[PDB]
Subunit: 334 residues, 4 copies
């Protein structure tokens, strides 16, 4: 399939040589290759897109990124620097590249203003945030976005009518020490990533974010970070036990997955899991994505192009869902 759209696609700031090499060494068997590709915006990245039937990618800042920065002024300065950098870096290829906003999430009003700045000025397509904001004087705390103090931010997101991609981050601080340090091969894609995002997303559900902000679109990578596996079980326990005991969110978990939540295929090129999600989530709410350069184009795209599924859903998941959700202009081979 030509003209696919992918949107969990990372870049790094070239000056961050040590940080990029550190993350590369934890996520890639060839870390110098990883570094070259996460730094490149317009050369190898577009050659891969041309080679593998990808018309358009929406770029986002690497994890942990700004969500690792616990000093609010340093975090804000890095978010601004990243946003200005990537807007300029993609300027030559508006037919191939868009960007998501990078945000410091220490303060709701500040994040709202920066999101508004770069969506309005640069035409960014939404925001991508690496789960909770690392915080505290020494980086031991974390900020979730499901409390009412974030209403001023979520109302900006819905006023702009752009999605928010809730990406994972590595575990840090006392949580890292107590749960993960002694089984550290589970940090990242094997388990820790999905546990963080699913906690936060279901926090958004059960703490009323989607009730207060019913137009809000939240995107989850990796086929939904475990959640569809338990769609039956979560729904049974919410509807039959937790709501009788006081849970007051207005809709069912299935209704939130129909109206507010999306899942992507990033890093999860599983035909069997995708077929399962056709039932539990539905092709209208599933988006192709790669997770480049943590994943390579060939793996994602040979898998997707090879899917022996119906042509309507293959087109929707491959590009047409994203074209409508992100209001995309005509892009290469759209």
């Amino acid at each position: 399939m030509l003209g696919k759209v992918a949107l969990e696609e990372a870049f790094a700031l070239p000056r961050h040589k040590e940080r990029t090499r550190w993350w590369a060494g934890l996520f890639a068997i060839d870390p110098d290759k990883h570094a070259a590709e996460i730094n490149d915006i317009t050369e190898q990245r577009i050659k891969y897109m041309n080679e593998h039937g990808v018309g358009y990618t929406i770029l986002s800042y690497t994890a942990p990124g700004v969500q690792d920065v616990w000093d609010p002024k340093e975090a804000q300065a890095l978010a601004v620097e990243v946003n200005d950098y990537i807007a300029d870096a993609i300027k030559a290829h508006p037919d191939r590249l868009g960007a998501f906003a990078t945000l410091s999430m220490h303060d709701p009003k500040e994040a709202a203003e920066e999101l508004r700045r770069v969506v309005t000025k640069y035409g960014f397509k939404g925001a991508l945030v690496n789960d909770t904001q690392r915080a505290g004087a020494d980086g031991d705390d974390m900020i979730f976005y499901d409390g009412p103090e974030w209403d001023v931010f979520w109302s900006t997101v819905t006023d702009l009518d752009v999605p928010f991609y809730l990406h994972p981050r590595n575990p840090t601080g006392s949580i890292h020490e107590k749960l993960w340090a002694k089984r550290s091969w589970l940090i990242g894609p094997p388990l820790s990533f999905a546990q963080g995002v699913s906690l936060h997303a279901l926090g958004m559900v059960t703490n009323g974010v989607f009730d207060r902000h019913p137009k809000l679109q939240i995107v989850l990578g990796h086929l939904g970070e475990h959640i569809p596996f338990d769609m039956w079980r979560i729904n049974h326990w919410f509807e039959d036990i937790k709501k009788p005991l006081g849970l007051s969110c207005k809709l069912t978990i299935r209704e939130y997955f129909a109206r507010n939540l999306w899942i992507t295929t990033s890093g999860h090129f599983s035909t069997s899991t995708l077929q399962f999600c056709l039932g539990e989530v539905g092709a209208d709410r599933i988006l192709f994505s790669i997770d480049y350069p943590f994943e390579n184009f060939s793996d994602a795209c040979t898998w997707y192009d090879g899917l022996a599924i119906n042509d309507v859903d293959k087109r929707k998941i491959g590009k047409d869902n994203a074209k409508k959700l992100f209001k995309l202009p005509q892009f290469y081979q759209s």
Copy 2:
């Protein structure tokens, strides 16, 4: 289908009735009925079994159980007390009721001896443990069982050749405060339970427990506590990235699910997820279970009895897999 076998089926101690009823306020819409049913062994429990086609259930101590007790002497005494209690309580129904061992997991040698004691004396079918053992100052510490100090325990488990059921427990202490207190509707079946068990089970995988103890059978409830959903993703990251970087476990995740792991249908009466698991896990390693009394018999058994799947797999999952695994 008649003669079904279920094995994530809880009881509590009668002397804890008030405590039991207090805690039931968070997960039972009728806490008085929940306390009555969890304390009952041979009356209502067997009546439900007879009415819903359950020939045999293996009973286990309710969560958090002994894993909530951070004083080692008190924990050990309670495990002993519970094991003797349930052996005596079920003794008149050998054809309908078995038991899993209850253990204090503060000390590997201590836990191995108590497991050996009750398996040999009472014919218990295995052990069931509610995830990590609370310990340390004020019970804020957590004991996982994937470190080398637990080899002496796992060696006793395989010597006895009985399975070990890794059951969830609620988050406690500072972890509870940091992650769950502000989104507490997610505590239990909605999310926290599976996050705990999958962390611990995949710690056993990656820290080599099944390589040092290849006979070991670990049973997971709730269709595998998220793990089968990511069978492809875990496998890809383990084989293609983590092992080249240094991960040293000898088998693939799929190989551990064929040799060492089992999943049950407890609290997960999902034809959709079960079908997905038929491909990713396989009918030979899936066991029916209920999670009574947090779940009721009618929900679990109406679902399973109505499953429109092939005859041979339905019988394997409903009873024959468990008959052979636990040698009933």
Copy 3:
């Protein structure tokens, strides 16, 4: 779920006392209740709709119906009689009942004119035809609609922009005797029905009906009459073998199922097969239906309402697909 739409729902003419008795003797355990329910249009049928959350049903003439009549003038007269009868019988329930055209398919131009007559005069939502038209002396011949001479009829269907539901018919004549008489319990839903419809519908594909008429919408019951089970196998043999050897289809079989074909859940209340069809066909092309009164409302509707599937597709399949495809107005 409330407001469901069903559209493989049959009626008979009340004067046909014996032809209803015969058909019921093969496919119904209570011939009395069957006759009473297939004859009813506004009473027990709306009672069932009210008890089971069905907002609207599109009614169609029983099988084999007009396709059993090999005398063209008797066949055309029955299609006219049926079309006037049902349009009258449903007129006081426009928020609950619609109708498909009944057609004699002896002649493309004749059938076209009658379809245009009843769509224009009564607002019928399409046509429903019970597979091939019996023809010739004794009625042993069969008229298929995939030849170029049917272009004027399919051109009418796409001009009116209404769907054509290709319903099964029993096996008759020499074919019945040679293949079905000595294994007659397979006649109908067990096997014969799907073998007829799949032959005809795949005839339309490979003889170019959808290439000449790209806007044409054909609806198949019973989750597609076996075809989705072989979507991979048909696709492989068409693309890799039949097309190098002459098959001139512009599109793949999957593309025709995306653009021209639909399937319904009539008489196939199988969660297993539906889930499989979400992959092979897709929720946008699947329609709830019952096959009343051969099936009862309770079986179809307790199954559908109970489906533990995503909310978007449950709404689309249950009602919203049909609302858009049949340009249904406000109803409940």
Copy 4:
């Protein structure tokens, strides 16, 4: 996966090479290659097996084969010729090649005697028959095997305890004229094949063949010739409607699929349909198959080797179900010449 076993794998007689090459013009893009490969037993065939991880194949006579021959004496003589031919042709490779019996099915006792002859003398693994036997004048009649006169045959099959593979055959004669001549692109794999076998197999079910012969094992290719798609629909209509009206078979359709029927993956390299069949049929009754040379080894084996399903079911379907059902030699894989 090495050591895979396939068993819908055809050959033709060399003396028919010109007729074979002609007919391949309709179902092979390179009919010269098709004729060369369907006529070869030990060279290219085994080379493909070596290259693609196939340890063992059971060979059978191509369709329509003896079922096309409506003179009973000619058909019997051909079946005998074919059986002696293939037994001799495969005899040096017992760890790579087995054979199914080829039968004339004009007369039950004659067919039973030939099946017994070649199972006993040659160690054939079962029978493979291309649906109904052409009979009568002009060969326009059809002999089905679900009537009571075939009981003597099915008792021989269960006494020998070998399976019977019910393979398709092209439509012929008047049925071909009436239904398929004007939509000839549906003849074969696209539709006609499955319609024939499913009618015949469900005739066996509803006419009580598996009640009179409960040990009988019938194998269906192409993931069951449509039938599992309608497992729910067939079961509902059998149990709730047709049995009250007089259908007298004793078990459900699911019970026959657990006890008497097998399906193979021949010509149906569909992860989607296979997964569906895991639920409706179960991995214990599913067998890998290729349908060579109509299908090529690369298509079947790259698909099967790439399947991301649980290890145990993959081994059962790929070889272990067949190793037990057809009593393959222990250590046969030591001869697999794997690359």
